[PDB]
Structure 1
Amino acid sequence: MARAVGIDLGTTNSVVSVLEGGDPVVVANSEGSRTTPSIVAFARNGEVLVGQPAKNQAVTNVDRTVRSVKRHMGSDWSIEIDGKKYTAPEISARILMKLKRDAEAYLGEDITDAVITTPAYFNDAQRQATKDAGQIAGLNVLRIVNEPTAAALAYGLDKGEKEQRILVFDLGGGTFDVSLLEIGEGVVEVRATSGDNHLGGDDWDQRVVDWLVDKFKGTSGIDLTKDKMAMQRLREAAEKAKIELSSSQSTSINLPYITVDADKNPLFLDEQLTRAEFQRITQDLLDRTRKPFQSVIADTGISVSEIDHVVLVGGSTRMPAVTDLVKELTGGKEPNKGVNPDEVVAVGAALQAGVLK
């Protein structure tokens, strides 16, 4: 293999791809899901879950669960987790130690080097934070590849030698980045960047869950805010409805017994969703993506026709709401496909690794 890897450490989708002789193999975590959810749940033990284990404790260790410390990398974003305050490098280093031993398990030895990514809206303070986390977790970022750059790598978007224009829409479950990329000579510039560092497809899921309990109380009048496990369940079902309606027009969701009803009957959940209503629901979350892209456009001053590739990264760009507003704003320009958007930036960062190896 490449003696290193690449890591789309998403804001909610921490993914790591290796190179089976150059073949981008996104490694199944020891959690099974190749995507580690980029969440670090400092369980009330001193122990620290990561991934869907941590995600499950986003409601339970809500007071001790960290999400989107990605955004807070460049500081001492130092969370008082039982003992002392653990800065963003160490919260990242925890997920990195997980991924480290997942890959060591997948291997038979600890081939540990990496190319771990940053949004193009990040700054070199966040990247110094990642340098420290690498001193911590024991994996090497021999170089960082910003996430749009590793996107254009991952789809092999080596268009024109003189210069190529790669549009990149990152929507991780917890991050949004519009990026426009002038690339050449094997050397990359993300020419422009905008986005919504608060928006993600789990913000999309959060709007979903809003609606869920909205019509829950529309009929009967109970709030799953009142129930923490119900919030966990809504959140999980909502993201899996995300990856569902990244292919499905509509997904009906249902749950047995939850809380007492008005007549003291253990109430449940049962109804269709239509993805039309979904893109209606993320509509201002879709406005949270457009004028970002207008800003990156003005930053580059480029016609969407002149763009030589478009890219969808971050698993919430499996969504066709993403691709809809793409082909709307991009003049119909189809982003390149071949890797899962969560897998994309990890894959292409791994390609950079192999380019080093």
Structure 2
Amino acid sequence: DVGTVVGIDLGTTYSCVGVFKNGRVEIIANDQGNRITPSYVAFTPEGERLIGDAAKNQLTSNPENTVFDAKRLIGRTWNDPSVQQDIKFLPFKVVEKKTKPYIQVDIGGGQTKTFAPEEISAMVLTKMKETAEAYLGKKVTHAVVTVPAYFNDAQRQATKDAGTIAGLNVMRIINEPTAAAIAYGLDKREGEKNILVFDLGGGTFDVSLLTIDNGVFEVVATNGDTHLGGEDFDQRVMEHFIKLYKKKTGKDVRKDNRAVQKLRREVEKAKRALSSQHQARIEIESFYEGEDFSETLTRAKFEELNMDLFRSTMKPVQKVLEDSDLKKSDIDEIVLVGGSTRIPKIQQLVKEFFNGKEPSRGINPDEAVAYGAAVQAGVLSG
């Protein structure tokens, strides 16, 4: 009937899919061997449609026809002031169509097409569905899908709609921070608890005050920063090296985007390394005008380059507490979500904010939301 239902984190920057198999949640790897998949769609001049890692990986040679951040636009009208702000920063065309912000791309050979934001997310969701189905060795028809807690009626419906386009019946839309809590078993626990969820993604920062009472969740207050994430930490590190280069050679890397992008790729990997190691080597062969890049980033440097950004995450946490009439002591559970929460310095800051109190631990913070979504998908068959 519903078959094996899947749990999908449909993220602004990365998506994740899980399933309940053999008494356990399995987070599923994609055709590229990754347990997270970029929420990107690229159309090539030859007319190929890329989704996920291959869309993300080419993109530097294709800014106009590579689509991301559709989640910023889904469920919104063209004239929403938020949309009008966002599209300033997007490198693809967005036009007014049927009152909505439609994405216009060159599909190949100069052929122009428009897509509703839920059409682009449907392509991503189709990628998640194939990832799942290859794992399971069978077709999937039903899904649990997560959304931010601040999502309104239209944004929830448009996500359901993206699922229907993708061949998915979205049985449950769940809030992302609730899914995270579920992954940690916090919905089981007896009596009333206040849960702070701190979700530092690749492009957005979400803080949520949740209440659990008899396995029923209530979102009391949300804050954060719509345009803060790990990518902002990457950018800081580029500017540092482009500056060091424009000092050691006189040359300016920004004249060549391909150089700037190659730096971006290596910075990303260095950033991930610095969560485990204390130094990382950034080495780009044939980086600008045949010449080579070697420099080495320390964790101490990474942190200094980002310290004000790291510190600015605490102010939404204070506002959330204020808006919900609670103080630090009132928090019984801290859940970290997002790849950036693996940054050792961000963990230190959250703990010190809460007076030495430890967060929940044991689930990859990139995977926690889909995990919880898979916990509920699990119950929806059996």
State whether TM-score is above 0.5.
Answer: yes
Q: Does 2:45 correspond to 1:44? A: yes
Q: Which letter does structure 1 place at the counterpart of 2:355?
A: G
Which residue of the other structure, out of 286, 299, 307, is the alignment partner of 1:257?
Answer: 286
1:235–1:141 Cα change, 3 Å: farther
- Over 3 Å counting, the alpha-carbon distance change for 1:45 and 1:120 in structure 2 is farther
Q: In the aligned structure 2, how far is the partner of 1:318 from the partner of 1:57?
A: 27
Contact 2:16–2:35 (Cα < 8 Å) also in 1: yes
* Paired residue type of 2:269: K
Q: Which residue of 2 aligns with 1:331?
A: 355
| Corresponding residue to 1:273 among 289, 292, 297 | 297
Deviations 1:246-301 (A, max 9, x none): 222221211112122xxxxx322112212222222223322441211111111223
Uncovered stretches (5+) of structure 1, i.e. residues with no partner: 261-265
Matches of 2:152 and 2:59 in 1, distance apart?
27
Cα gap change, 1:216/1:122 in structure 2, threshold over 3 Å: closer, same or farther?
A: farther
Query: Hey, what does 2:61 align to over in structure 1?
Result: 60
Write the distance in 2 (CA, Å) between the matches of 1:147 and 1:33: 21
CA distance in 2, matches of 1:113, 1:175: 28
How far is 1:160 from its partner?
4.1
Report the counterpart of residue 17 of structure 2 in structure 1.
16
Per mean C-alpha deviation after superposition, the further-off stretch among 97-106 and 223-232 is 223-232
2:272 pairs with 1:243: yes
Of residues 222, 232, 253, the one that matches 2:261 is 232
Go from structure 1 to structure 2 and tell me whether the alpha carbon gap of 1:349 and 1:195 turns closer, same or farther (over 3 Å shift): same
**Identical residues among aligned pairs (%):** 55
Coordinate RMSD, CA, aligned: 2.0
Return 96-105 or 66-75, whichever deviates more: 66-75
**1:70 maps to 2:62:** no
1:195, 1:287 → 2: CA distance? 13
Q: 1:345 aligns with which of 351, 354, 369?
A: 369
Query: What secondary structure, in the 3-state scheme, does the structure 2 residue paired with 1:126 have?
Result: helix
Helix, strand or coil: the match of 1:25?
Answer: strand
Question: Which deviates more from structure 2 when the two are superposed, residues 114-123 or residues 191-200?
Answer: 114-123
Matches of residues 161-310 of structure 1 in structure 2 within 5 Å? Answer: 161-260=190-289, 266-310=290-334
Shift of 1:2: 7.5
Q: Distance in 1 between matches of 2:19 and 2:271?
A: 26
**Which residue number in structure 2 is paired with residue 263 of structure 1?**
none
Give the drift of 1:311.
Answer: 1.1
Kindly report structure 1 stretches of 4+ aligned residues shifted beyond 4 Å.
none
Cα distance change, pair 22–299 in 1 and its aligned pair in 2 (3 A): farther
3-state SS in 2 of match to 1:346? helix
Query: Distance between the aligned counterparts of 1:140 and 1:229, measured in 2?
Result: 41
Whole-angstrom CA distance in 1 between matches of 2:219 and 2:22 = 28
Alignment partners' CA distance in 1, 2:49 and 2:268: 23
In 2: Cα distance, 1:120 partner to 1:235 partner: 31
Give the conservation status (yes or no) of the 8 Å contact 2:40–2:66: yes
Q: Is the 8 A contact 1:195 1:288 kept in 2?
A: no
Aligned residue for 1:135, secondary structure, equals helix
User: Is contact 2:102-2:117 (8 Å) kept?
Assistant: yes
Distance 1:98 1:280, change over 3 A: same
- Aligned with 2:130 (options 96, 101, 118): 101
**Distance change (3 Å), C-alpha of 1:221 and 1:178:** farther
Aligned residue for 1:285, secondary structure, equals helix
**Distance in 2, Cα, partners of 1:206 & 1:150:** 30
Cα distance, 1:207 vs. partner? 1.6
Give 1:302 shift: 2.1
Aligned residue number for residue 343 of structure 2? 319
Deviations 1:132-175 (A, max 9, x none): 10110112321111111111111222364232221111111122
Change (3 A) 1:94 1:304: same
The one-letter code matched in structure 1 to 2:69 is S
- Higher fraction of strand: 2
- Asked if the contact 1:310–1:335 (Cα under 8 Å) also holds between the matched residues in 2, the reply is yes
1:40 Cα deviation (Å)?
A: 2.0
| Matching of residue 87 in structure 1 with residue 110 in structure 2 | no
Mean alpha-carbon deviation: is it higher for 154-163 or for 18-27? 154-163
Say if 1:356 and 1:97 are closer, same or farther in 2 by CA, change over 3 A. Answer: same
- For CA contacts below 8 A with separation 6 or more, give which structure has more relative contact order: 1
Q: How far apart, CA to CA, are the structure 1 residues paired with 2:275 and 2:256? A: 28
d(CA) in 2 for partners of 1:44 and 1:190? Answer: 45
Gapped regions of structure 2 (runs ≥ 5): 77-99, 107-111
Q: Equivalences for 1:133-148 in 2 at 5 Å?
A: 133-148=162-177
Q: Which moved more, 1:102-111 or 1:237-246?
A: 237-246
Assess if the C-alpha contact under 8 Å between 2:164 and 2:170 holds in 1.
no
Deviations 1:187-235 (A, max 9, x none): 2122211111111111211222222212121211333322232233222
